[PDB]
Structures are given as structure tokens and as C-alpha cells.
Write a protein that binds this ligand. Structure first.
Ligand SMILES: Nc1ncnc2c1ncn2[C@@H]1O[C@H](COP(=O)(O)OP(=O)(O)O)[C@@H](O)[C@H]1O
Length: 390
């Protein structure tokens, strides 16, 4: 045993307090509560997303922890807010979303063989009967927007419940916290459900963790879940210094905690009394996303788009980007520039990706608004160099 409590390291564990997102949780929780306390109970739809390609940055955690503190602060006011969490990777339709929600309520709502609409009505009625409020988390919400097994009208009936399913006493008792992978979710939403999107109370973008933030996160897991003589700060700094986004990493707290976990269980198999720097570096060592799968040609092409975007141009034409890609491809990346239809297939792939936007009337292209060019280019150049040398 290096562990004093192994649960602290499970993927699902939230700590009893936040030390990095900690302010921006008690606060939000303050938002959610003020609407409750001012009357007009629970109805807002809020949203959390990150940058594109970023994972393990505290989205889920911030949401779960925010809902929990809303519950607690509400309880002190004698109110009663219930929590539901639903992951879209587990919920292919409206039926299955509602069924997960009601099972977490504990209410006696008939769910077997029942219409979705009927479940939602029973839920609205139980919340009135109980005088309870429900705050629902919809995680991986982007993959609900694209799912063809969920229609616009389903998202509407859920997310504007109160417009379609009035309360016995007029009090709205369901709010939602959407968690999406990135800002592309908002376009989709304006496409599919603009009547909800134009009405979102708070949209919060979360940045990837810096090294000092990863330190603070690891330290707290160490304090809570490892024996006190087992780690020193130096051991934690070896992970945070590599994964901190200010030092060229991901900013992933999941990669950071997993690494620390792994090193602890390597020490244990050795019967060792503590961590050693070696074990941590070993873990860090055996431990960009939808950019990481692209072809050098797509990377090379997308890079040049960001440079136009970086130096004046809003919208490049096809012919121009074409010769530029040709010029750079053979002369600068020693790869042989592909043919015309193949180039335009790359260009279709990056637009289907929301990494590039098109403008029809060959087609006009600019870097997707949400990507910073100078720093994407910096990223696109590490991934571009992992492919040059193979
Ligand atoms: N602010 C934080 N404080 C403590 N732990 C965190 C924090 N943010 C993230 N974590 C941890 O890092 C891992 C990844 O977090 P998660 O919320 O799943 O990121 P995302 O949803 O953006 O992929 C989880 O173990 C989570 O507990």
C-alpha cells in the first residue's frame, strides 16, 4: 500500500472541494440559486464546453460539482434540488434519456413500454407532488445534436419542457446543464434548436489546465488518497511539468491523475515504501484529437488556411490555397502534393470537421472562428513533425 484510499483515484471520483475550478463552481451555484430564490424556480439552460480536441479538463467534474453545491445551498434554504446526470454515449434517444433521469430521481414513474412524452409529464407531476426541483446534467451533449436517433422536436420537448408541459402550480422545476466537447456544439444547436440556443443563460468555456493547476489537482489527490510519507512535491511536478499546457502538453487532469495512479501501483508491485522519480517518469512515459488523425496533407492544408487568417485574409479562394499548398508541400515538408479532386476531398473533410468553414457562391474558406491561428499553427507543427519523422 501506497494508497490510503484507492477510491480517490477512480475515474468517477470528485473531491469534496475544488481547488482549481472552485470559485467558478460556488459562483454558478450562486446563479442557479438566485433564480430559485427570486421565484421563477428552475428552468434555465446553461452550458460548459472546452477547446476542440481537449479532454480531461474538468468539464464533467465542474458540472457534477456545480449541481451538488446547488443542492446543498438550496437545502439550507429548505428547498430540495435533485441531481440527474446523463451521458449521451449511454442515451441514444429521448426515451433512454428520460428513463435514466427518472431512475436517478427514485420516483415511481412507469417507464417500461411508455411514451417519452408520458414519462416527461409524470416527471413534471411528481416534482409538483413532492415540491422538489430537478437539475439535469446532459454530458457529451454534441453527440445528442448529431445523433439522427434524436430529432429537433425531441430536444425541444425536453429542453423547453415548461413551454409544453405546464406545472399544476405554475412553478418550473427542471433546469439543465449542458456539457459539450467544444464550441462547435453551439453551431449545431443554432442549426437544430435555435429556440433554445438563443436563450442560454451562461456559456462557459473552460481552458486546458496549466502545470500549476495540474500540480494543485495532483497534490489534493495525494493528500486525500495516498499515505503522507509516500510522495513528495517533486514527484508530482514530474507529471504536471510534462502535461501542463504552458509546457507543451494537453492540459489533461485525467492523464495527470492516471499517471500518478500508475506510478503508485508500480511501486506497490515492487514492495517499495514510497514513489521514486524513476517510477513517475516511467508512468508519464507509458501513459490534438481530431487534428491527430489528419493526413499531413490535411494538416499542411489547414496550416496555410490559418496563416491567411493570421495575416489579414478572412476567406481564401480555392485556386490560391491550392498553389500555396503545392509550393509548401514539396519544398517545405518534402511530401509530393496531391491532385485536384483529392485536395478538394481534404477541404470537404475539414469543413465536416468544423475546423474549416465553407462559403459556396469554387468555394471560399477561412479558419474556423473558434481556433486561435498562431497557437493552432504551433500545435499543427508538432503533429506535422511527428509525421515527417516516423
Ligand atoms: N478542478 C478539478 N479538481 C479536481 N479534479 C479534477 C478537476 N478537473 C478535473 N479533475 C479530474 O481529472 C479527470 C478528468 O476530468 P473530467 O471532468 O472528466 O474532464 P473532461 O470532462 O473535460 O474530459 C477526472 O478524474 C476529474 O476528477
Amino acid at each position: 500500500g501506497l494508497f490510503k484510499d484507492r477510491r480517490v483515484f477512480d475515474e468517477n471520483y470528485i473531491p469534496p472541494e475544488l481547488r482549481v475550478r472552485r470559485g467558478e463552481a460556488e459562483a454558478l451555484a450562486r446563479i442557479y440559486l438566485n433564480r430559485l430564490l427570486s421565484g421563477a424556480g428552475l428552468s434555465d439552460v446553461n452550458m460548459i464546453y472546452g477547446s476542440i480536441g481537449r479532454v480531461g479538463i474538468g468539464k464533467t467534474t465542474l458540472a457534477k460539482f456545480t449541481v451538488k453545491r446547488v443542492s446543498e445551498a438550496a437545502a439550507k434554504e429548505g428547498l430540495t434540488v435533485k441531481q440527474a446526470y446523463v451521458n449521451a454515449f449511454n442515451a441514444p434517444n429521448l426515451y433512454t434519456i428520460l428513463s435514466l433521469i427518472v431512475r436517478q430521481t427514485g420516483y415511481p414513474i412507469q417507464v417500461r413500454g411508455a411514451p417519452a412524452l408520458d414519462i416527461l409529464k409524470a416527471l413534471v407531476d411528481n416534482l409538483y407532488v413532492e415540491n422538489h426541483y430537478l437539475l439535469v446534467i446532459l454530458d457529451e451533449f454534441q453527440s445528442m445534436l448529431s445523433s439522427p436517433r434524436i430529432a429537433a422536436e425531441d430536444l425541444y420537448t425536453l429542453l423547453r419542457v415548461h413551454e409544453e408541459i405546464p406545472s399544476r402550480d405554475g412553478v418550473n422545476r427542471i433546469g439543465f446543464l449542458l456539457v459539450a466537447s467544444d464550441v462547435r456544439a453551439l453551431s449545431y444547436m443554432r442549426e437544430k434548436i435555435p429556440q433554445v440556443e438563443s436563450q442560454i443563460g451562461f456559456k462557459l468555456h473552460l481552458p486546458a489546465y496549466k502545470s500549476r493547476e495540474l500540480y494543485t489537482i495532483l497534490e489534493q489527490r495525494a493528500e486525500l488518497g495516498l499515505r503522507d510519507t509516500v510522495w513528495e512535491p517533486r514527484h508530482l511536478e514530474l507529471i504536471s511539468d510534462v502535461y501542463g499546457e504552458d509546457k507543451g502538453g494537453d492540459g489533461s487532469a485525467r492523464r495527470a491523475i492516471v499517471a500518478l495512479k500508475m506510478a503508485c501501483e508500480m511501486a506497490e508491485a515492487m514492495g517499495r515504501d514510497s514513489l521514486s522519480e524513476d517510477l513517475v517518469r516511467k508512468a508519464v512515459s507509458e501513459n490534438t484529437h481530431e487534428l491527430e488523425a489528419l493526413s499531413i496533407h490535411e494538416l499542411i492544408i489547414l496550416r496555410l488556411i490559418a496563416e491567411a487568417t493570421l495575416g489579414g485574409m478572412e476567406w481564401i479562394n480555392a485556386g490560391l490555397l491550392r498553389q500555396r499548398y503545392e509550393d509548401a508541400s514539396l519544398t517545405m515538408y518534402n511530401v509530393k502534393p496531391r491532385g485536384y479532386t483529392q485536395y478538394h476531398i481534404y477541404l470537404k473533410h475539414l469543413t465536416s470537421l468544423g475546423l474549416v468553414d465553407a462559403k459556396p457562391s469554387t468555394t471560399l474558406f477561412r479558419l474556423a472562428p473558434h481556433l486561435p491561428a498562431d497557437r493552432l499553427i504551433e500545435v499543427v507543427d508538432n503533429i506535422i513533425q511527428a509525421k515527417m519523422a516516423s
